A paper describes a structure:
Eukaryotic protein synthesis typically begins with a specialised initiator methionyl transfer RNA (Met-tRNAi) that is delivered to ribosomes by the translation factor [name] as part of a larger preinitiation complex (PIC) with multiple other translation initiation factors. Only by re-engaging with GTP can [name] participate in further rounds of Met-tRNAi binding and protein synthesis initiation. This requires the action of [name]. [name] first removes eIF57 and then acts as a guanine nucleotide exchange factor (GEF) to activate [name] and facilitate Met-tRNAi interaction and rebinding of eIF53. Structural studies of [name] have shown that it is a decamer or a dimer of pentamers. [name] has a central hexameric core comprising an [name]α homodimer and (βδ)2 heterotetramer that is linked to a pair of γε heterodimeric arms. Here we have used single-particle electron cryomicroscopy (cryoEM) to resolve the structures of [name]αP/[name] and [name]/[name] complexes from [name] to an average resolution of 3.9 and 4.6 Å, respectively.
The yeast strains used are deleted for the sole [name]α kinase Gcn2; hence, [name] is purified uniformly dephosphorylated at the ISR regulatory site. The 3D map generated for this [name]/[name] complex is remarkably similar to the [name]αP/[name] complex, with two [name] molecules bound one at each side of the [name] decamer. Therefore, to build the atomic model for this complex, our [name]αP/[name] core model ([name] with [name]α domains 1 and 2) provided the initial [name]α/[name] atomic coordinates. Hence, the [name] subunit structural models are highly similar, with only very minor rearrangements. When the Ser52 loop of [name]α is examined closely, one clear local difference is loss of the density associated with the S52 phosphate. Specifically, R53 is reoriented in the unphosphorylated complex. In addition, there are minor movements associated with R55 and R64, the latter moves away from S52. The density around R54 is weaker in [name]/[name] than in the [name]αP/[name] complex structure, suggesting that it may adopt more than one position. Overall, the weaker density in the S52 phospho-loop of the [name]/[name] complex prevents us defining precisely the positions of the side chains. This likely points to enhanced flexibility of this region of [name]α in the absence of the phosphate group.
Residue numbers in the entry:
A (entry chain A), B (entry chain B): 1 to 305
C (entry chain F), D (entry chain E): 192 to 381
The structure:
Amino acid sequence: MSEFNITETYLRFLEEDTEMTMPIAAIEALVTLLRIKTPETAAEMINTIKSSTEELIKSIPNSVSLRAGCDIFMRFVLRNLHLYGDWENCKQHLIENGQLFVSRAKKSRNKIAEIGVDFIADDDIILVHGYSRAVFSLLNHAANKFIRFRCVVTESRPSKQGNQLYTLLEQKGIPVTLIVDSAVGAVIDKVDKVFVGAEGVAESGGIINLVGTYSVGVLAHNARKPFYVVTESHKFVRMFPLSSDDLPMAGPPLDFTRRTDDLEDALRGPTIDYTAQEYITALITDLGVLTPSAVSEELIKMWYD
Amino acid sequence: MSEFNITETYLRFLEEDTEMTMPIAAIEALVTLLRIKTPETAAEMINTIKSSTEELIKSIPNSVSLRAGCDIFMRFVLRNLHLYGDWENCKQHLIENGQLFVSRAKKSRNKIAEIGVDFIADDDIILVHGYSRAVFSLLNHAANKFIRFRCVVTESRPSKQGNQLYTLLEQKGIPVTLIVDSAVGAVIDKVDKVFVGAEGVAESGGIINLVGTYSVGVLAHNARKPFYVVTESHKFVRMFPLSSDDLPMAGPPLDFTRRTDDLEDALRGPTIDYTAQEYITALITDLGVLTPSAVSEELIKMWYD
Amino acid sequence: DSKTVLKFLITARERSNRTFTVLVTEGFPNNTKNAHEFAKKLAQHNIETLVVPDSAVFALMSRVGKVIIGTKAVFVNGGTISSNSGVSSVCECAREFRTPVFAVAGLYKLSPLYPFDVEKFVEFGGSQRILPRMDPRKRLDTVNQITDYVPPENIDIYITNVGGFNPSFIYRIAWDNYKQIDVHLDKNKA
Amino acid sequence: DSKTVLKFLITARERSNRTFTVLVTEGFPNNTKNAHEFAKKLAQHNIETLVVPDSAVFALMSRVGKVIIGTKAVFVNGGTISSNSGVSSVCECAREFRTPVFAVAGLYKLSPLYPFDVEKFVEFGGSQRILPRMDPRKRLDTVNQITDYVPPENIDIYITNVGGFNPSFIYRIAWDNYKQIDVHLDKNKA
């Protein structure tokens, strides 16, 4: 007898492997939610997940990649309840689909590595920023193809992830430097291509991942380099700003409260930025390469109704 | 019997007070060099400092604010030997000038605080970056005038200085946040003015101070905010690039050598950037406020001959 | 409201017999006194002229590739203190189309001072001629402005009596006419 | 070398009786075969035409505020595969003056593929007609180019048979004509 909310199902398998990421872990928790708890009626099933997704937003309010996972699972079970099976087969007809994304969204990243080959060409110095793991699997395919390139890793401050990526692919055997994020503007002229990855895509095409992907994006547009971004086909959320201000973590990005005893002072600003359509130029899906205008329409094609 | 080269005169008084800064400490060492060691002849006096300045560049090769101090001291003693006193009075006529800069260049910063008042106006949120101490003395005058404003401190990574400035003026009593340098691009729209300070001014107007003053400068030009910079009238060097590549610390900004045992990996990129005339809009001298074209001509008015 | 270009475009048609036209907007509602006076005297010297409204000046900016601005005063940045109203944003709209922006200024129109605050030199006007109803009970608020300021990035040249000059060169003409002591023109030499 | 605008500007003068001119440069040294052929037939239909050299096209770009480009093929980005030579940098020089950049393309000139490498579609030419001396002992090197590519940021519209379209809308016309399987047109479905 589980409850699927916090850790009695969900945070079990987040300590199982750091190959599954946050939103499909919620998708893995949401598909097994109605699988065991199948209350033989179409009404309270969706009322179970509306209780369960809204407390899951309440569980971690500042991991809005989960909110994209909370978004499209409702978009999954809506059309899966469509084809009009009167809930008779649609109990089984949903769970015979069932384990799709643990067989399909797990193979997002290698399918990204199938079609993201011909971006990193011969002798491209590559600017990466933040642990967006689809980039590394694209770089895993690049080392396994023995195609020639180099790599440059920025910081990820304060999220520390840039120190991991230097250790992650030096053992793989790529010539690489870790650079500070402060030294982007004096180095970007030698840099030719640049790869990042969003935690979620907004309505105009959003980069809702890290602290300064918009900073390195607006550098690259004045450098006039193709600012690519690597993601997959389950990373879409309706949450869409008008400025570069999303929901913050807890407070406004200009706090002026004081240090009580020894409180952290680098952690006063934001941790999530926003980039509109203007500064990206292409992105990757499991559907294929995608222009920043088509990422608006496919995020609206089944979203208005 | 001293030798004035490394620490037998120079590095004595750099542990005396952290109010004197690096170039005038070299100026303090250079004026006391020929003061005691006055070898009664105009020839080997300048040959003494040409020996002494070039080993001082050799002493610390990567503190090129000292090189600006090594630059203009020769420009001091040249015209001070001019007025044509046949070296007869010009021994005394130099040392009666003598202690000028320990009485005048020490009062650079308060004179900056005399005329840099009417930049920080009523309710200006201020973006600062790096310990350029003339800014804080301008901010010291701002708190002592009880003019109304706020403050935002960035990082200074890896040079750590942003953690000092938060502690330095919170005790002074200013509402302030420390922000990461990664979160500049998502916050700069609310920011109105921005203050930095160079270790030296190049021929077109150079910002040769820190790691990412060019990064925050190119942000502010797209934000279309007046990118001011605070320095003084003894911070000029002939050293002038064509790109944003100066002399580096020891190697090129894209190294690809590997980690032997545990070597530092944030310290692989540069520590000094460059900004041309395009991204600054005004600067402060002891002579007055100065446009970025006049800082070219005064750096050439006594420099061609 | 620039008697320079009012006098200049007479002989710019007369001696040099170049034919062209001038669009002219209004300084609403203040230089529209003189804006209707301006093109009428140019209609006497018949330089194909036509009056545009202030709202239309973006919609015809794609056609025109040259603008001249008769300013009132000019500071050390090359940011000039212009005439009454409407001229700053259209100087901005000109700059966005990569259109050269001209200005005329006498040598005595120079000023050795710095624009510290833009708003301490931007003078406003009255609530009278911007709405005349004067409601005391509804009583909304409204803003006039009888000074526009432009940055030197939006300007290109200074047609002066001693030549055309960069927006950043303005100090060297000024410091050949002014000194560093009396720019802080005050008895308290603090 | 665009038979579209060769045929189009006939009836753009004939039915619509608009009078104008066209500047025309050469695709040196390759479309200059047809560049002298192009304005001559337009001199028959007498649209005030004049031939410019390739170096002069910046110096007269300040006057002209509209350019049309007859392309050869077009991909999914809105970056189009143009005609032979010289047309990319002048499309860049047009974009810098904030000048609208036109293009014409049939619906069959669409292509559902992506420009992964620009250089795998930029085809070059010969060392013959770019210098004819053929030195074997001095023997310098020289580069020809018979394909130019432009980014979609340098283009504005697609005058097609089914309307004018955004540079970023090009997928929706294309995916109403093509499918996701045969864009990877290869027997190995890896």
